[PDB]
């Protein structure tokens, strides 16, 4: 039906129908009389998978023959979401599959909804890794994603009595048709033991062994016939493990727990032994695989010419001492040569400056679990500090600040300092964040080695985040400027010539309206709730965290409610305020924020004086598949973190691409988005980084704001007195106490400017033509935020490889 | 090449090659350049599996339409072995697959050796269940096997320093291509809780829930296009299970442990809670499935007309109170009606009279785990004892003996008594065993309800145990009498007309000689040991147990050694004595017996005076796939259990079919084998049951035999003094002490007759023509021991269904 979804040729459709029926019969062992919709989904997924495998084999064969430099992207998280539609988009099969299924009496959209998200990440960091894989394949890079195949991904969120409850995400229950187990490339990983010093070096002995079994998933590029690999490791006990008899078999679970569950924290370091085991597990298995592939092309001087290892935050930082262990202890390279190879091979991306997010492992843990790695870390530290002392003689405090070993009650290893010492490139993820790294937390390292420090502003894939989730928008764009923009997003600039075009204005608004109707209906069906689709859709979706300031949004919502109640017969622009996201299970304040949001909804949504002027909805179980539905429906994107706290953001970019305007602080990538679109086309408010710093020097006193702003005082009195919790009047006292006395994120300091800026949003929404013209100016300038741009910069400036848009033969 | 393996038509071969390459490419995601032999095995298995699925769907469809009476065979064990060859045999595909693989440059026999045994049983009981499934499919019965999908089957046995070591049997590591997961038919199973009595009956509440997920495996009949189902249940935790967060997810293993591992005991009741959970798990899931299928054909009067449930020993005995629970508590039938339905539905097969093998569960366990079932058991008992009291008034001791509840230190439920009370048929597994049941342990029950008690002599499938494992023998038989004997084994009687046929005599001996050469070579390759293939192959393979008397065999072997050493220059018929089998991990005496056998080997095999006259080999890791290799190579089958202890045996039958002569006691099915072949064609020795009873009344005194038999005294002195363990002279004192003072199985009492009978074996082996003529008389009369005969008797005399040799259409 729509051009960007490709051709539905008679031959293709016939062949797809044949293969669908073949899989239903032979693969699934069903006939049409007892097949369920889930069987039909699987028969389609196997049909589409067959089209990948030829390209997958040929791509991997091509890399063996050409022997290009290989890029290894190491991450503890790959937030992939669903695969079926993305595969169809990238193979140009969507219209053919639609037609084929339609002729079989089936609705393909319904089958798509059956697939489970691969929820192997927490939020932005995990999703960035997924976008990056898509871009590396699209740009023809010989790239491999390496991670852990968690049995349970990010928990499913249920809301019960307004509180978050967690349920296990048993995503593999019905099988995963996309992966291929490769038990033949199973590798041993060692833990515990002790170090023996012999005549010819150190030996790590008496270890416990866990096997790492790989599962491979194909990663198709956009219409270029390249299919790369994501290799995820699963933990298995050896067969002699603990080998009365019955108990020894049941105790195999202790080893296999390593890959059981994703730690559900976003921007918070928990410090548990199981997490450290996960980190080493992924690193040790991956590095053996890398070395095997290198040897099957003595001479490790060429290793950095054939291998790049990108560390996604510090989570895989043990790659640095593990590489040194292998080169020194097993290959018998001298230390200095090994270190040169290591530094030239590794590069580190930092994703946060929040102190509670930084990994600082207790020395006693490393000593017990990884005794050889601790020795190597100490030697790295001594040699590194010797360089510092030579460059800054007498500066004893600098030595203490830069040490990999932190002194204190418990000695800890600072993993970020290890990553900087052992990498040839260190980057932040947006311009403001990379500057903050050089001025504050890594200032000392920047002064020693300025050449290491770079910026690589984040991006998102326009395949998933435009073509897949918003085909109506993709199509009206394609009608004007063709299809090349899908792999060259800078071509969206051509849309600025259609800012005064009456037909284009109408089409952009029509597509938004359709997306809003479709989402309003989705809400009714799956969650028994009614919304006005003519209201402004005001959306804040992201993990729940104090720094992201869902609480600031809550204060605005209550302000609007109180204004309506004060002057009920005055016109206000109707809004549907939607907030969604998961709280980490142990993060009490985040769980209280969720409860506050639902409690505000319980009052606002049932007040007959409000009517359909204001609705507050908590969107349950926010995840990649839900993002694909809500983002195309949004009018206003809330990006309201305290300046200096959101390293980049990527949700922000998804909203910009899909025709929402942004209300935001000058934080993370918001700064660059505003620069690209023009500040006049963005709703900027609040303290800049420098203003936050000035307040911190003086002392933040929240009481001053309470005393000066009557509207704010009223809200705090309502919270304290039980207005939003009549049966439990003190339910929110922890929230009030934090806001008044211990608010690290200065919610009150941005309240007045936020409310005023929100009034400007409402004023523009009253003039649909001008709202839509501003939207066009945003979409048109979103090209910089393609992850294709991001990856091309990594490739050229860090990895030393050239991207290619050349197609492999089919 | 050979006729019984079917046709290799050009069209068939071409199609198999095409599909093999299709699976290698699309299913396995390999090309020929990186494929391993394991990949080739999987590509073949998927190719053969495709030929099953059409017949499988059609068979199950046919049962839905015709609605025949369904037979449910409940077992905790299904000892299946490998599937690939058996599937080819039953579909007549073996020669075509051989030719197809040969044209691809591959050796099919090598690929077959890659497949793991499905080792989901311990020995005879589990293997009987597997033979039965094959016969039920071959006889066109609408039959379902129901069990547990253990993650770890019977342990792999390694011998280290002559001792058994156990290793986990991780049989699913590389995947199982034969099964199909059916997560859509997942069912809840309840544990713990308590009983509430309401106005309208008992309710079982506050239970813990475990999910039972079914996996289905096809069971093809012999060339009749029938494919039945074996449904095995796997334990899964619900997603809200224990739902800090991380620990709750890791604790899901506690529920999933139910299906983790097979208890490795043969003829020994251990009494562990986990085993009871396994028993209930299989019963509760299976009964829900049965009832669902019955309702999808109010009125449970027709239930026994549409359903038969066969209990494989007492392991699934909880089916009786579970059926009552469902009918009374959930369907609201009155007790008497429910009991009538239950009794008419259930039948019980007993497999042992050894007292330590009988299940007697402590009441406190049932009270905690299954409180409603315990109440139902007590009510069954009271009503049953009321009938006993009315039939035998005043006989208070009979009431105590027959009670389902045993008094004592700990009260126990006798599960055999429950099975008799709640079944319309009770059978033993060989004539002598069924008679023993009526005279001894179930005498009281027989007097109350004589009509319940039957015999069904065991059997083996001639598909696996002749055609598959011994194609050379199958072929030379087929050349004379055609192929119909493979599904009608009584036709082997026609071979008696070829007992004086010189060509047939020569061919029978030639096939044995070929099998011996092939096995001698297998031993060299896989286990670095050399044997004389002209020696008599004297084989005892079965689980290690005192009752099976591997020790009696050991005494004969030492006797032969001592005779050689006494008169080294006298001719003796050369022998290779092979003993193999697993010991249960906690059965200390069984483990000592293994060590004795290897220690005898260490002395005998290295004595230069013995030469190649005598070799003693312990066959490591005895299992179904090893049975298929060693049994066709055997000359002498050792079946030497103390009279009254081996309920039937089935190894005995496998040897008879494959051209070995038998040395044995009049125990189990040996009695019927000797009756069929003629006692003159069997090497019978030792005490009969009545002689054992006479010795028990007088008192067995082993010292008397030691005092009277100099050859026996010498052996005991050798064991005691360290002749077979020079570095640890007292290593075998537990064995000596048991034989001299606490031998329940009267080894010494049968020693003299055993040695004399063995001398008669040697004398016959010296005359190859007469040995082979006796062999022909055994093979010719083995027809009774087809499991097809056994199943036809169950079908007619217990289940009330008619077997059919009619083919479904292809
Ligand atoms: O489990 C942990 O220990 C953990 C998880 C995520 C993070 C994390 N740190 N930063 C992020 C997000 O990364 C994305 C992608 O760069 C940025 O857009 C966000 O600004 C940042 O918060 N996530 C830190 C620690
Ligand atoms: O795990 C247990 O608790 C268990 C296992 C097997 C047995 C068992 N009882 N009898 C058998 C064997 O059954 C076969 C098949 O009928 C007979 O041929 C053997 O004689 C018998 O020992 N096995 C008892 C208990
Ligand atoms: O000996 C070979 N001949 C041809 N191709 C090979 C050989 N070894 C590896 N390859 C290719 O590389 C393999 C995948 O690379 P790996 O990820 O290093 O195992 C296969 O996909 C092959 O296409
Ligand atoms: O509604 C129906 N129409 C046709 N066949 C059915 C229907 N329901 C069940 N069946 C058959 O029975 C099913 C298997 O039986 P089950 O083991 O009871 O699920 C399928 O194999 C079908 O062939
Ligand atoms: C993009 C995305 C995020 C990151 O959003 P931010 O607003 O940048 O934190 C988190 N979760 C999901 C499911 C996403 O798709
Ligand atoms: C047949 C068989 C048995 C039973 O043999 P018995 O000699 O009757 O105990 C045990 N194990 C395996 C592997 C078998 O094939």
UniProtKB/Swiss-Prot annotation, chains A, B:
Post-translational changes noted in the entry: Phosphorylation of Ser-3 converts phosphorylase B (unphosphorylated) to phosphorylase A.
PROSITE patterns: PHOSPHORYLASE
Modification N6-(pyridoxal phosphate)lysine, positions: 654
GO CC list: skeletal muscle myofibril
Enzyme Commission (EC) number: 2.4.1.1
Residue positions, PTM Phosphotyrosine: 192, 215, 446
Family statement: Belongs to the glycogen phosphorylase family.
Protein name, UniProt field: Glycogen phosphorylase, muscle form
Protein species of origin: Oryctolagus cuniculus
Lineage, opening ranks: Eukaryota, Metazoa, Chordata, Craniata, Vertebrata
């Amino acid at each position: 039906q729509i051009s960007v979804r490709g051709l539905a040729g008679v031959e293709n459709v016939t062949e797809l129908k044949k293969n669908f029926n073949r899989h239903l019969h032979f693969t699934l062992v069903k006939d049409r009389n007892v097949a369920t919709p889930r069987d039909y989904y699987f028969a389609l997924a196997h049909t589409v998978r067959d089209h990948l495998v030829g390209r997958w084999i040929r791509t991997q064969q091509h890399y063996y023959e050409k022997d290009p430099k290989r890029i290894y992207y190491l991450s503890l998280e790959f937030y992939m979401g669903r695969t079926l539609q993305n595969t169809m988009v990238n193979l140009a099969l969507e219209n053919a599959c639609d037609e084929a299924t339609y002729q079989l009496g089936l609705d393909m959209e319904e089958l798509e909804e059956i697939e489970e998200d691969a929820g192997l990440g927490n939020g932005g960091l995990g999703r960035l890794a997924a976008c990056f894989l898509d871009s590396m394949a699209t740009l023809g890079l010989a790239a491999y994603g390496y991670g852990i195949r968690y049995e349970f991904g990010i928990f499913n969120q249920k809301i019960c009595g307004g509180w978050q409850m967690e349920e296990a995400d048993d995503w593999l229950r019905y099988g995963n048709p996309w992966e291929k187990a490769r038990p033949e490339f199973t590798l041993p990983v060692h833990f515990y033991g002790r170090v023996e010093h012999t005549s010819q070096g150190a030996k790590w002995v008496d270890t416990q062994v866990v096997l790492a079994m790989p599962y491979d998933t194909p990663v198709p590029g956009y219409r270029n016939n390249v299919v790369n690999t994501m290799r995820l490791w699963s933990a298995k006990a050896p067969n002699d493990f603990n080998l009365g008899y019955i108990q020894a078999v049941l105790d195999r679970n202790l080893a296999e727990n390593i890959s059981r569950v994703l730690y559900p924290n976003d921007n918070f370091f928990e410090g548990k032994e199981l997490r450290l085991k996960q980190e080493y597990f992924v690193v040790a298995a991956t590095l053996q695989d890398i070395i095997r592939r290198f040897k099957s092309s003595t001479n490790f001087d060429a290793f950095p010419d054939k291998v790049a290892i990108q560390l996604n935050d510090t989570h895989p930082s043990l790659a640095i001492p593990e590489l040194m262990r292998v080169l020194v202890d097993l290959e018998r390279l001298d230390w200095d040569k090994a270190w040169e190879v290591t530094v030239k091979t590794c590069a580190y991306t930092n994703h946060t400056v929040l102190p509670e997010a930084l990994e600082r492992w207790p020395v006693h843990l490393l000593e017990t679990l990884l005794p050889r790695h601790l020795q190597i870390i100490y030697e790295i530290n001594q040699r590194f500090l010797n360089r510092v002392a030579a460059a800054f003689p007498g500066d004893v405090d600098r030595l203490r600040r830069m040490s990999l070993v932190e002194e204190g009650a418990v000695k800890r290893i600072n993993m970020a300092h290890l990553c900087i010492a052992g990498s040839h490139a260190v980057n932040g993820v947006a311009r403001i964040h990379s500057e903050i790294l050089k001025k504050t937390i890594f200032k000392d390292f920047y002064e020693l080695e300025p050449h290491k420090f770079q910026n690589k502003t984040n991006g998102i894939t326009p395949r998933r985040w435009l073509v897949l989730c918003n085909p109506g928008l993709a199509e009206i764009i394609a009608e004007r400027i063709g299809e090349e923009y899908i792999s060259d997003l800078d071509q969206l600039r051509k849309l600025l010539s259609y800012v005064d075009d009456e037909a284009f204005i109408r089409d952009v608004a029509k597509v938004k309206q359709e997306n809003k109707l479709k989402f309003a209906a989705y809400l009714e069906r799956e969650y028994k709730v009614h919304i006005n689709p003519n209201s402004l859709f005001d959306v804040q979706v992201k993990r729940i965290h104090e720094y992201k300031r869902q609480l600031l949004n809550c204060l605005h919502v209550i302000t609007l409610y109180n204004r309506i109640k004060k002057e009920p017969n005055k016109f206000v622009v109707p809004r549907t305020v939607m907030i969604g996201g998961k709280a980490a299970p142990g993060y009490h304040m985040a769980k209280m924020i969720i409860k506050l949001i639902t409690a505000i909804g319980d009052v606002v949504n049932h007040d007959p004086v409000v009517g359909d002027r204001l609705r507050v909805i908590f969107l349950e179980n926010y995840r990649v598949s839900l993002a694909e539905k809500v983002i195309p429906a949004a009018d206003l994107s809330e990006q309201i973190s305290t300046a200096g706290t959101e390293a980049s953001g990527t949700g922000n970019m998804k909203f910009m691409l899909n025709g929402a305007l942004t209300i935001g602080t000058m934080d993370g990538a918001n700064v660059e988005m505003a620069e690209e679109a023009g500040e006049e086309n963005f709703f900027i408010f609040g303290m800049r980084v420098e203003d936050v710093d000035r307040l911190d020097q003086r002392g933040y006193n929240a009481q001053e704001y309470y005393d000066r702003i009557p509207e704010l005082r009223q809200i705090i009195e309502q919270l304290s007195s039980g207005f939003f919790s009549p049966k439990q009047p003190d339910l929110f006292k922890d929230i009030v106490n934090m806001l008044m006395h211990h608010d690290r994120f200065k919610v009150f300091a941005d309240y007045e400017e936020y409310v005023k800026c929100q009034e400007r949003v409402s004023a523009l929404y009253k003039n649909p033509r001008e709202w839509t013209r501003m939207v066009i100016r945003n979409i048109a300038t979103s090209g910089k935020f393609s992850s294709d741009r991001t990856i091309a910069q990594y490739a050229r400036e860090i990895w030393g490889v050239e991207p290619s848009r050349q197609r492999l033969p089919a």
